[PDB]
From TrEMBL:
Binding site for Ca(2+) 4: 159, 161
GO molecular function: carboxylic ester hydrolase activity; metal ion binding
Annotated gene: Cut190
Organism: Saccharomonospora viridis
UniProt lineage: Bacteria, Bacillati, Actinomycetota, Actinomycetes, Pseudonocardiales
Protein's recorded name: Cutinase
Residue sites binding Zn(2+) 3 per the record: 48-49
UniProt-annotated binding residues for Zn(2+) 9: 203, 252
Part of the whole protein covered: 47 to 304 of 304
Domain PET hydrolase/cutinase-like span(s) in chain numbering: 2-258
Keywords from the named record: Calcium, Hydrolase, Metal-binding, Zinc
Binding site for Ca(2+) 5: 175, 205, 251
Binding-site list for Ca(2+) 3: 33, 36
Positions annotated to bind Zn(2+) 5: 139
Residues bound to Zn(2+) 8: 175, 205, 251
Annotated family: Belongs to the AB hydrolase superfamily.
Binding site for Zn(2+) 6: 159
Length: 262
């Protein structure tokens, strides 16, 4: 059996639920932490199923952790440590945001309070971010190729080539976004990732740039499924990812399914 499985066998209803099966606690991290602007760690309270993987979550240009706060309880309650960070400055660029995502992960591994550290599997780490923070998610996977997953949400980056990334990457685009338009950001990034990388692209019908900053069940269910599949190696979640989702909220989906269990 896979020792990283947590929680009951999933259903489409259970991955859409606002509160997953774990209760959640928080730990605040001061902005004086090294290499990033501090943040909030959301973690599952229950320990008897084992330790958990972690995802560091970055905001976009001129945004702060509050724009990403809803991921904390939503995702942690399905069995993840979720660290919503602030950046060094509000004006930081995608490369800087990638470096800071890594600094936040290293803080979890090396410096976090014992309540977090005792719940963490330091070998199973992921990144996620919105807009320039999604560019940061891409960057972080080049800077740290041992990451288990990357989730660029309506990502923004001037560099359109990501052909050496080896970290499973799930890009979410917003159909009507004019700040990080999918035609020039999300889709080029997706198509530039290796054809043989486990990857997906989900475009949300009607959505605008700030769609990832408020609760969105279509985002949540597939973010949870991606993190389960890749951070936890949990093939009970393959059923939601492959074949491609058909939810009405989705206007286009691309993938490299099947994601062979490796
Ligand atoms: Ca700092």
């Amino acid at each position: 059996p896979n020792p990283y499985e947590r929680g009951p066998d999933p259903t489409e209803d259970s991955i859409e639920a606002i509160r997953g099966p774990f209760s959640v606690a928080t730990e605040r991290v001061s902005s004086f932490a090294s290499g990033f602007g501090g943040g909030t760690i959301y973690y599952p309270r229950e320990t008897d199923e084992g330790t958990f993987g972690a995802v560091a979550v970055a905001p976009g240009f001129t945004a702060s952790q509050g724009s990403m706060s809803w991921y904390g309880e939503r995702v942690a309650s399905h069995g993840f440590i979720v660290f919503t960070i602030d950046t060094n400055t509000r004006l930081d660029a995608p490369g800087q945001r990638g470096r800071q995502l890594l600094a936040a992960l290293d803080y979890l591994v090396e410096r976090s309070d014992r309540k977090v550290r005792e719940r963490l599997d330091p070998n199973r780490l992921a990144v996620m971010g919105h807009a320039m923070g999604g560019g940061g998610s891409l960057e972080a996977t080049v800077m740290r190729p041992s990451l288990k997953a990357s989730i660029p949400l309506t990502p923004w980056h001037l560099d359109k080539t990501w052909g050496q990334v080896q970290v499973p990457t799930f890009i979410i685009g917003a159909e009507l976004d004019t700040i990080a338009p999918v035609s020039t950001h999300a889709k080029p990034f997706y198509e530039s990732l290796p054809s043989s990388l486990p990857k997906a692209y989900m475009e949300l019908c009607g959505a605008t740039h700030f769609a990832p900053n408020i609760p969105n069940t279509t985002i949540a269910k597939y973010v949870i499924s991606w993190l389960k599949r890749f951070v936890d190696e949990d093939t009970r979640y393959s059923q939601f990812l492959c074949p491609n989702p058909t939810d009405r909220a989705i206007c286009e989906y691309r993938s490299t399914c099947p994601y062979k269990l490796n």
